[PDB]
Design a protein around this ligand. Structure first.
Ligand SMILES: C[C@]12C[C@H](O)[C@H]3[C@@H](CCC4=CC(=O)CC[C@@]43C)[C@@H]1CC[C@@H]2C(=O)CO
Length: 478
């Protein structure tokens, strides 16, 4: 059986540790990608418009632009207003300047008060790219090989990073950031699938948890790496460079054997086992994804949980809010929860800590809803506890999701769940604003109820414990 064969080969070897380290480096690069948007756009100290006579005056006073800021309209900075030479203070459209030496995307692309809509639209389009990337890349990875798709996706990530680094204007930047998003989702998700596939079904929990740990390590390094290489071109190039180095290695990290032995070849899979022995269906379909009743229910609850967790996390971070030390603290805070799951699993069921995390997040949201005019410390710590619970939820969710889906289609359904998560990420801010206009703290209550029903629902899962991985239709064990 596919279990005895993997038993003959060492479950954990030096080669497996090396490929794990390489794919964790891929994961931290992906983490660099997602968190790049915030630091990429930092509002400068000031900005103001220019006029013809104003330009003539600045020609004699171009040095020390803060002098021009002191002399220019204070908006009554900038509030996108301009002076026409009790003088006319009308808004403008061009001739903007910035006194901040730290180059930013906002300064280069001239994103202003009437133009911050596209400042948010950059992130929105990135989420849309993530969604379509999951959608297309799951099918592409199921049809073709997995390793070849990862290397191909990484190539695209690198070229997209370079081109958005050297983008002349806005629309090309937006389109190629969309392409970067699809490629990044593909490479990250394939990397997760491959690390889950290579290892046997006892040390998979540490595999997923440590991948998460490397993601947290990347967001941790993000604040530290940002202080040096200030030029926005520099940080963008630093983000995109490791993708090429990942593309560099092909001989290591071979094709997954379990996926390979699916009647497509079989003989090739045996050769791969010998290579790692140094130490000692035309295509996937939706209708097949949903046709089975119990599998349909499992899929529906999984996508529901992805959606609710993503939206409550987005709401909580929006409620939360320096520019480097705060990011560093947020990075380090995430580690103890991941350690908590790392220690907890194999002593308890997998669905229980997820349900506990969802209940904790809902309770935290409900508590933060009340006492609006009280002290800030209690609301702050309760919101932080809810956020920590919701991240703990994410790590637990990735492992369970990978187990429920069958091996004949693994990257397919998980991509759909990730796509619903991305869609919730897109739709969160509009819902937040709409439900906050009527009355404050109402979205927090709604998200608390949503998380409560989510945690109640997860109890219907088949506990995904000690069953290894299911083959084709054997998924519906129950
Ligand atoms: C929440 C984490 C950061 C971020 O939130 C991740 C999440 C994994 C799923 C995921 C995929 C996306 O397409 C958007 C980001 C995100 C939703 C991560 C799990 C651990 C990690 C952290 O612990 C860092 O906060």
């Amino acid at each position: 059986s596919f279990d005895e064969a993997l038993q003959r080969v060492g479950e954990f070897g030096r080669f497996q540790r090396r490929v794990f380290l390489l794919l964790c480096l891929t994961g931290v690069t992906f983490a660099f990608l997602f968190v790049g948007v915030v630091f990429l756009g930092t509002q400068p100290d000031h900005y103001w418009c220019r006029g013809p006579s104003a330009a003539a005056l600045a020609e004699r006073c171009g040095w020390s632009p803060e002098e021009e800021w002191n002399r220019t309209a204070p908006a009554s900075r900038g509030r996108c207003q301009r002076y026409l030479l009790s003088a006319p203070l009308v808004p403008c459209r061009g001739g903007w300047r910035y006194a901040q030496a730290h180059s930013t995307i906002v300064s280069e692309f001239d994103l202003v008060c009437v133009n911050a809509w596209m400042l948010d639209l950059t992130q929105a389009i990135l989420n849309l790219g993530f969604l379509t990337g999951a959608f297309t890349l799951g099918y592409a990875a199921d049809r073709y090989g997995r390793i070849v798709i990862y290397l191909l996706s990484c190539l695209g990530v690198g070229v997209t990073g370079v081109v958005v680094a050297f983008a002349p204007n806005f629309p090309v930047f937006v389109i190629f950031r969309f392409l970067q998003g699809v490629f990044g989702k593909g490479t990250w998700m394939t990397c997760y699938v491959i690390v889950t596939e290579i290892v046997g079904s006892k040390q998979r929990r540490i595999v997923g948890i440590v991948i998460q740990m490397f993601f947290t390590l990347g967001i941790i390094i993000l604040p530290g790496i940002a202080y040096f290489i200030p030029n926005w071109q520099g940080i963008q190039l630093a983000i995109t460079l490791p993708s090429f180095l990942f593309l560099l290695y092909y001989w290591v990290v071979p094709e997954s054997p379990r996926w390979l032995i699916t009647r497509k070849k079989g003989d090739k899979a045996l050769q791969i086992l010998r290579r790692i022995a140094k130490c000692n269906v035309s295509n996937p379909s939706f209708l097949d994804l949903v046709r089975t009743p119990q599998m349909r229910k499992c899929t529906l609850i999984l996508m529901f949980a992805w959606f609710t967790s993503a939206v409550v996390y987005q709401g909580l971070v929006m409620r939360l809010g320096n520019l480097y030390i705060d990011f560093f603290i947020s990075g380090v805070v995430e580690l103890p929860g991941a350690l908590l799951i790392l220690l907890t699993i194999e002593r308890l069921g997998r669905r229980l800590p997820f349900a506990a995390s969802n209940i904790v997040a809902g309770v935290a949201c409900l508590v933060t809803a009340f006492l609006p005019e009280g002290i800030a410390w209690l609301r702050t710590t309760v919101a932080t506890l809810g956020r920590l619970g919701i991240t703990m939820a994410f790590e637990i969710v990735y492992l369970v999701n990978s187990e429920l889906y069958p091996t004949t289609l693994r990257n397919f359904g998980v991509s759909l769940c990730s796509g619903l998560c991305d869609f919730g990420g897109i739709i969160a801010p509009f819902l937040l604003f709409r439900l906050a206009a009527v009355w404050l703290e109402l979205p927090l209550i709604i998200f608390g109820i949503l998380a409560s029903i989510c945690g109640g629902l997860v109890m219907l899962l088949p506990e995904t414990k000690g069953i290894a991985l299911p083959e084709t239709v054997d998924d519906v064990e129950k």
